[PDB]
Amino acid sequence: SKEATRKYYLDLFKRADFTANLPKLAKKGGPDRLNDALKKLRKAGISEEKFAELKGAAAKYADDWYRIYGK
Amino acid sequence: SSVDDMYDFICSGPLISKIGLTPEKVAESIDEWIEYGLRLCRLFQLNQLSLNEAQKIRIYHYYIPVFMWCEQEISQHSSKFKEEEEIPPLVIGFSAPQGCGKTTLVFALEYLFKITGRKAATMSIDDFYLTAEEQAKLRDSNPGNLLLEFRGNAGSHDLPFSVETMTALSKLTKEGVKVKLPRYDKSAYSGRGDRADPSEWPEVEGPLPVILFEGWMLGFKPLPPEVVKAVDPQLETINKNMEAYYDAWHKYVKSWIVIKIQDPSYVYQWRLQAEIAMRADGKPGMSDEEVKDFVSRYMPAYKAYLPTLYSEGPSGSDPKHVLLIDIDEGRNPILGC
Numbered sequence A: 001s002k003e004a005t006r007k008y009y010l011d012l013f014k015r016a017d018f019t020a021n022l023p024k025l026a027k028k029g030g031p032d033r034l035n036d037a038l039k040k041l042r043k044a045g046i047s048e049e050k051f052a053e054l055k056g057a058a059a060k061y062a063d064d065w066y067r068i069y070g071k
Numbered sequence B: 001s002s003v004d005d006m007y008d009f010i011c012s013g014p015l016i017s018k019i020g021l022t023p024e025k026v027a028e029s030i031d032e033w034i035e036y037g038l039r040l041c042r043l044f045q046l047n048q049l050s051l052n053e054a055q056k057i058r059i060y061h062y063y064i065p066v067f068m069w070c071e072q073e074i075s076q077h078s079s080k081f082k083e084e085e086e087i088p089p090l091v092i093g094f095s096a097p098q099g100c101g102k103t104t105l106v107f108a109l110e111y112l113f114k115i116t117g118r119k120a121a122t123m124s125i126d127d128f129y130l131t132a133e134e135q136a137k138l139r140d141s142n143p144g145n146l147l148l149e150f151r152g153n154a155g156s157h158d159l160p161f162s163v164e165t166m167t168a169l170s171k172l173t174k175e176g177v178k179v180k181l182p183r184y185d186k187s188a189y190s191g192r193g194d195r196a197d198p199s200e201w202p203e204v205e206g207p208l209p210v211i212l213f214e215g216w217m218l219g220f221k222p223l224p225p226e227v228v229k230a231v232d233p234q235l236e237t238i239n240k241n242m243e244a245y246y247d248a249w250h251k252y253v254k255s256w257i258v259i260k261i262q263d264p265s266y267v268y269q270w271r272l273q274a275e276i277a278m279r280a281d282g283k284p285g286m287s288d289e290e291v292k293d294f295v296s297r298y299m300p301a302y303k304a305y306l307p308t309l310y311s312e313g314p315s316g317s318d319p320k321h322v323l324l325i326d327i328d329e330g331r332n333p334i335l336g337c
Helices: A003-015 A033-044 A048-069 B003-011 B023-028 B030-043 B053-078 B102-115 B132-141 B159-170 B225-231 B233-242 B266-280 B288-311
Strands: B090-095 B120-124 B210-215 B255-260 B322-326
Touching (some): A003 B023, A033 A048, A033 B003, B003 B023, B003 B030, B003 B053, B030 B053, B030 B102, B053 B255, B053 B322, B102 B120, B120 B159, B225 B233, B233 B288, B255 B288
């Protein structure tokens, strides 16, 4: 039941594809939510081009987090 | 420990498979999980953000899954009646030995029911002990049977009182109807104990949906005296008494939880450490021999009747409505499937 977790972590990226899907994501985990999800996903085994697209999307989510809960 | 991490941790618990829950259900109710974790952390003044592995295991592998299971049992209980059809209280019986988190569990379980809008009432079997004079008279009938001198073994329980108390609890289906919870004081008469005076008892109003019923002896069944006589001669009377316990408790408990321990001797261990912690901190602490006598007197019943639970199960139990929690030496749920 590991691909329940891999599916959870990729489907977590689909869950963040909207700007109006942030609010309850972004109380905890942090601005680095999808970055750490990508860490766990690389460790689970993922391709490099998916890694590049993710490493872009997670940075975008970090900016969209700092935009509302930054200093 | 971020939300995602906790998810993973929750999914690796030994009870996720056993309460019927799934990774999707965990993902869909992770908000409920984390709010329950917050509430339990405050209930123990824990930190959430500074939890060691034992605390995390209790909260997210032990307490919350059991709360989820119990609330599902009440859900399926109340789904069986119609509008204006009054709902009888659901009595969930906890069959676990002494000092195995059994007591603090129900304290945690009861608390979450209060938070989530189900009035909760807790009754230990020990609250139905024979009063001090009745206990003394029970002793006098068996002057040569030590196990009946003091409390806990079969006989020390005021069964007519237990039956009336359990019957009166059930009629809390409307508001206004009440019932006093009989509290038992364990320190009366030098530490022997007597029932708390009935004018000091907590009282529950309204319709109560869940009742939490704990005891070291719940689920124990009448055995053939041949298993009994060889484990201890002083159990044969205690065996014959529990035949009359089949009918005052097992009728009334619908859902069950059986904390199952690895080796009964743990009880002694678990007792001593506690008292040792008291004696180390310089507090009223039973002596080593005192604790040894105390535990070694309930041990004759454990070795007789614990085997039956693991083999068959509790007596007035339905197999789909019994949860088994195997705890390790640290009172934590074992991943024994």
